[PDB]
Amino acid sequence: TFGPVFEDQPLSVLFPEESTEEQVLLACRARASPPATYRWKMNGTEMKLEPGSRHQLVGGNLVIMNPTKAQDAGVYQCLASNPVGTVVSREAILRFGFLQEFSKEERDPVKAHEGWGVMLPCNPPAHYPGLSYRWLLNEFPNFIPTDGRHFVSQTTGNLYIARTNASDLGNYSCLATSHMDFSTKSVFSKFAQLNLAAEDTRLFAPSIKARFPAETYALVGQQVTLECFAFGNPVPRIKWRKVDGSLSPQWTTAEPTLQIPSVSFEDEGTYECEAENSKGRDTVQGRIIVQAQPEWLKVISDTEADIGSNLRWGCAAAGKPRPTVRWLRNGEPLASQNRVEVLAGDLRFSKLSLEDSGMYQCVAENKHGTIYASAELAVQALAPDFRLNPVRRLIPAARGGEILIPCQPRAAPKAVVLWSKGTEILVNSSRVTVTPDGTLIIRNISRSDEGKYTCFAENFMGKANSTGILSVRDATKITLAPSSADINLGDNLTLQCHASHDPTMDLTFTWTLDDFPIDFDKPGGHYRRTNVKETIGDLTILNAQLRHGGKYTCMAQTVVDSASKEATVLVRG
Amino acid sequence: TFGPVFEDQPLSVLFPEESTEEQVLLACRARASPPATYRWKMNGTEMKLEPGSRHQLVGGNLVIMNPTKAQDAGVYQCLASNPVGTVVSREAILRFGFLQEFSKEERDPVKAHEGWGVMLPCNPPAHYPGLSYRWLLNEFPNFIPTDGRHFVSQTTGNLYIARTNASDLGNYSCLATSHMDFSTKSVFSKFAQLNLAAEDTRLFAPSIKARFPAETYALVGQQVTLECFAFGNPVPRIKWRKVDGSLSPQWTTAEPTLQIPSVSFEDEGTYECEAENSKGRDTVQGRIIVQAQPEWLKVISDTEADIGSNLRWGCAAAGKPRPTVRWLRNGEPLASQNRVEVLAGDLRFSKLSLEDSGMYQCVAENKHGTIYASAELAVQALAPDFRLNPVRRLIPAARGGEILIPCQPRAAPKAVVLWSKGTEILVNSSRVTVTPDGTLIIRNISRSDEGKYTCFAENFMGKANSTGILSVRDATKITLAPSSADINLGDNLTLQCHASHDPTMDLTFTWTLDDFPIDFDKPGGHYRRTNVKETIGDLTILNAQLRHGGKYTCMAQTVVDSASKEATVLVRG
Numbered sequence A, B: 001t002f003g004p005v006f007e008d009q010p011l012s013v014l015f016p017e018e019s020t021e022e023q024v025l026l027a028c029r030a031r032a033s034p035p036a037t038y039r040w041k042m043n044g045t046e047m048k049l050e051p052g053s054r055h056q057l058v059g060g061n062l063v064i065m066n067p068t069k070a071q072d073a074g075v076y077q078c079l080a081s082n083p084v085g086t087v088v089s090r091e092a093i094l095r096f097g098f099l100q101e102f103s104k105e106e107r108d109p110v111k112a113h114e115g116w117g118v119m120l121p122c123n124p125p126a127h128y129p130g131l132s133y134r135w136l137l138n139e140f141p142n143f144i145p146t147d148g149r150h151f152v153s154q155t156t157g158n159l160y161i162a163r164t165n166a167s168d169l170g171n172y173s174c175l176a177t178s179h180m181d182f183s184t185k186s187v188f189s190k191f192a193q194l195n196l197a198a199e200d201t202r203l204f205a206p207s208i209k210a211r212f213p214a215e216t217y218a219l220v221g222q223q224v225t226l227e228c229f230a231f232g233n234p235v236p237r238i239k240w241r242k243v244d245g246s247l248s249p250q251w252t253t254a255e256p257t258l259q260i261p262s263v264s265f266e267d268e269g270t271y272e273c274e275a276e277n278s279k280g281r282d283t284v285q286g287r288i289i290v291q292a293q294p295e296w297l298k299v300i301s302d303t304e305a306d307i308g309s310n311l312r313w314g315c316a317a318a319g320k321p322r323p324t325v326r327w328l329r330n331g332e333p334l335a336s337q338n339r340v341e342v343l344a345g346d347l348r349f350s351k352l353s354l355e356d357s358g359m360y361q362c363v364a365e366n367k368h369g370t371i372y373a374s375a376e377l378a379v380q381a382l383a384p385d386f387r388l389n390p391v392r393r394l395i396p397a398a399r400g401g402e403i404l405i406p407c408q409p410r411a412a413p414k415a416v417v418l419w420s421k422g423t424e425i426l427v428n429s430s431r432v433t434v435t436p437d438g439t440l441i442i443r444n445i446s447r448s449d450e451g452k453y454t455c456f457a458e459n460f461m462g463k464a465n466s467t468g469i470l471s472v473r474d475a476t477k478i479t480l481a482p483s484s485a486d487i488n489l490g491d492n493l494t495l496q497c498h499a500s501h502d503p504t505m506d507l508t509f510t511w512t513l514d515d516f517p518i519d520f521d522k523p524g525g526h527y528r529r530t531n532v533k534e535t536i537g538d539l540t541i542l543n544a545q546l547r548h549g550g551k552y553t554c555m556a557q558t559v560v561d562s563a564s565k566e567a568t569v570l571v572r573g
């Protein structure tokens, strides 16, 4: 059995008022064996799913019929529950697109002069999502022309005219258009009137009226617009620059509206916009800081772990502003416990148990978003198995030496190792040591130590035993060590290595120069074996040169043990 | 399913002629799942087990009833067969004990002198096992007295008298006794006559007549007897010594028969025995060579191995004479093959396959005996499984750096790795490579490399896929390295470390001294952080002493990457 891992997460749904169907489907599907029970949260609490009600679970999908803004707008969160564990899905926002009408009362006309700029505030109503604004010169559908004299704001909707003349007299009206996922809605305002006086025949300095704000909190990958429209006679050129840097040249325009389509982290900084004509200039500044969603850097994965082991899980996320990772067991938040410790970051287990098995979730959150990561912790109880890594079945041992017999079975938790020789239980003494990781240390080994070494590994699930046959032979001992000597260039030198060993076994002689071995397969070679017998292993250097000096080690070994002695040969004084 | 491992091997049975029952049980039992079919070999060929015949399988045991020496004296060798493999047991000798009668014809009398020693050969018949010999002075049942004047040999049975006198006249007869596992048999010889002349009143030098042989090939743990009886007037003292060593003092006797109960390898050498009286001495020599059975030093074990892997199994035996080690597959002997190498020793597989699964046996054989060791080789075909070692899930990468993504699944044999990005299969080029162990190496990494990398592992059992989501972030770069400086004792020194990183992540600064870290938790400590900001990580050494000189490394890291710069601070000129 394995826990629920999601393949369909719920998406945030903008439901239009001009909809084609009357149902909202929020999707949730998670792979588990057995298939999981799905429960939904509405605003944190557990919402009820009786038959005959307006909330229907079709398998894992939630279908809401008859939705309204006053009932069903908000937080939807799916939960998949197994007997292994319970996982919590991603945040779904069901949000309702609305567009209120304008005020139907009388609005005052605006008086101005010919040749000066005029403002006309739109006063737009409450809305979701962001409106696209237009203005009119006459009735519907006669729009304003989109020239360089009249400007409709994309942020506040207000109409700004840099210079009025005799052709601007008409019936003004604001207009708004909401573009949604399934429909498009358009409203228009109450009608306005502009009254104009006689012409002031002067040229004057500009002043910036339509202003982009002081801090624009951008996000990565989304289009950012800024406005710097101004008054003027004549019409002023608009210049954009960066105060603490330089602009990228793919989108530099001489326009009152600056639209940046792909915002990355080089777009963060201080911006200055400028209206300039032949009577002078005006500048105003602002800032764009570029913020980011959380993405994961490293996550947690499905861990089979033993009972009682230490375990560290790391889960880290990147984002500007920098996220607080918060942890979950089975849908409820995991605090610091008796064995489970959250550092709001990496999660440690001191001594695991069977209560700590389940689905664990890593939540990364800031004010730009919240992401989730799931992992199954399977804390396993295991019997001691000597099939994979047993006690050594045949243990050769040197007479008078010291051997190490490990008993390390595959066990969860750490098994009690009780050693025995035949039917006699081995205790610590001054000669035989039972170390509690499993190893048996036998020093000063004689002929009474041969036999039946049986390890009993025991924990609360079960018991097992393993058997090592131990036989004690004589050790390999060098009887004549080689002697260090200094020679000249081209002399003969013979080094002795006599060994003694148990005559059941087979002794061989390796000779090494600075712990690197000596080739003897060259015909006419300069290294020769001398007095080749069972116990005599002598080495002759013939015609010695400058590369033949160093430390020669005679290593007389059998297949179960070894002995080594050293000598130093120098070839030049 | 697992192979047959023996728990009952057959033992060599000496069957008596004076038997209590008429059946021979030779035992064979091997643990296997399913339980094994047992076939016996007798003298190498397969022996037929029809109902109504005189050879009955009671499960695994062989019962031979009505046994005779002319039919059933021979070797028996058990075989356990399952569909995994076939194992061959240790050889059991069924050998029949027999004791023939003496010759019933007339034997000649022996004439000698009074005071001189006499020999009387027994001429014993054919026998198994070794007989214990006695002689007589008259008819049955009075024996010879066991004094120092008359000696019965344990090797040839011949009676030797060192000095004859007037009380030795009688009816002599040899006698032999066989001690066996279920009965004891005794025979006695044809009657003899010793004729004696007048007494020679002289004292003379001894001469050794009953001689221990020149080479006595002993074994370990076996009692060895030697004889050095001699003639003489008076009765000579017998001395034993070692020529190439010294005797152990636990068994030194002044006796004509030297019996050593426990023979080890210090008993091997040259021996001299001596008969001495007041008219002189005599010495003769021999040799005892201590030999051994094969014992194993290192055996083979039950191995699950992949298809196509190299595999070396060592198998080694100790014993004098030194054992030739032979290998078996399934009852037939394994020579060198197209993929299987036997070097009469270690066994090498170059590329394994499904034909090479089965039970493999290791035989050690010399002329003192043969021993066996069995191991299952399970050559396994495996599908690619990414549950234990996947392609890593959420990959970070530096912008313009270098990554390696391993696709190493658990697969038997080595799976073909086909990498992909989305739906398009990655080829070698000059920017991205696919190494054939599974490693996708990407250099010069930009924003077009961000996405979904799927490894396909394919072999002839099956296919699997794994998926790594890779995001490309800007690397940690040190914008201003620390500078090396020379200071005096007690000066302040400030080292700068300015770094730059992608601001989606978080940056930390580790400061190390000769790649060992710097403690900052001391109040009033001599190492201080300076200008603690997001990107500025400076270090001030205050009141510098002689232990503060070395190489300081500033390692500015995030959690997915790092950058390091070095400086050298010395405190004394």
Ligand SMILES: *[C@@H]1O[C@H](CO)[C@@H](O)[C@H](O)[C@H]1NC(C)=O
Pocket: A042, A043, A070, A071, A073, A074, A075
């Ligand atoms: C759920 O939350 C949203 C805003 O958080 C709220 O508008 C809505 O009325 C809430 N619904 C219920 C049933 O509490």
Ligand SMILES: *[C@@H]1O[C@H](CO)[C@@H](O)[C@H](O)[C@H]1NC(C)=O
Pocket: A149, A164, A165, A166, A167
């Ligand atoms: C507004 O009036 C001035 C003066 O008559 C003229 O030069 C200008 O072109 C007019 N603008 C438009 C858009 O007609």
Ligand SMILES: *[C@@H]1O[C@H](CO)[C@@H](O)[C@H](O)[C@H]1NC(C)=O
Pocket: A428, A433, A434, A435, A436
């Ligand atoms: C046996 O000896 C070792 C070595 O001192 C010690 O660590 C261990 O605790 C002892 N075992 C028991 C059961 O006391």
Ligand SMILES: *[C@@H]1O[C@H](CO)[C@@H](O)[C@H](O)[C@H]1NC(C)=O
Pocket: A464, A465
């Ligand atoms: C050792 O293990 C085997 C396998 O279960 C069991 O049959 C046997 O009784 C054990 N021996 C002891 C002494 O517990």
Ligand SMILES: *[C@@H]1O[C@H](CO)[C@@H](O)[C@H](O)[C@H]1NC(C)=O
Pocket: A490, A491, A492, A542, A543
């Ligand atoms: C080694 O010794 C022999 C006799 O001492 C001598 O003839 C021979 O030349 C020597 N070898 C070399 C390489 O000098």
Ligand SMILES: *[C@@H]1O[C@H](CO)[C@@H](O)[C@H](O)[C@H]1NC(C)=O
Pocket: B042, B043, B070, B071, B073, B074, B075
């Ligand atoms: C089997 O072998 C033994 C000696 O190797 C021999 O005495 C016996 O007659 C043989 N039996 C048969 C049936 O060949």
Ligand SMILES: *[C@@H]1O[C@H](CO)[C@@H](O)[C@H](O)[C@H]1NC(C)=O
Pocket: B149, B164, B165, B166, B167
């Ligand atoms: C054999 O004869 C001699 C001489 O009469 C005597 O000294 C000796 O004791 C005799 N031996 C025995 C065993 O009676």
Ligand SMILES: *[C@@H]1O[C@H](CO)[C@@H](O)[C@H](O)[C@H]1NC(C)=O
Pocket: B428, B433, B434, B435, B436
């Ligand atoms: C792709 O490139 C690596 C690196 O040179 C090389 O080892 C490998 O054989 C190439 N793959 C193929 C299918 O040729």
Ligand SMILES: *[C@@H]1O[C@H](CO)[C@@H](O)[C@H](O)[C@H]1NC(C)=O
Pocket: B464, B465
């Ligand atoms: C990847 O593996 C799954 C598991 O068998 C399989 O259903 C799927 O079709 C595979 N995809 C490709 C592209 O081979």
Ligand SMILES: *[C@@H]1O[C@H](CO)[C@@H](O)[C@H](O)[C@H]1NC(C)=O
Pocket: B490, B491, B492, B542, B543
């Ligand atoms: C470090 O610098 C300040 C100002 O230069 C000085 O007053 C102080 O004594 C210095 N520290 C030591 C330990 O000399």
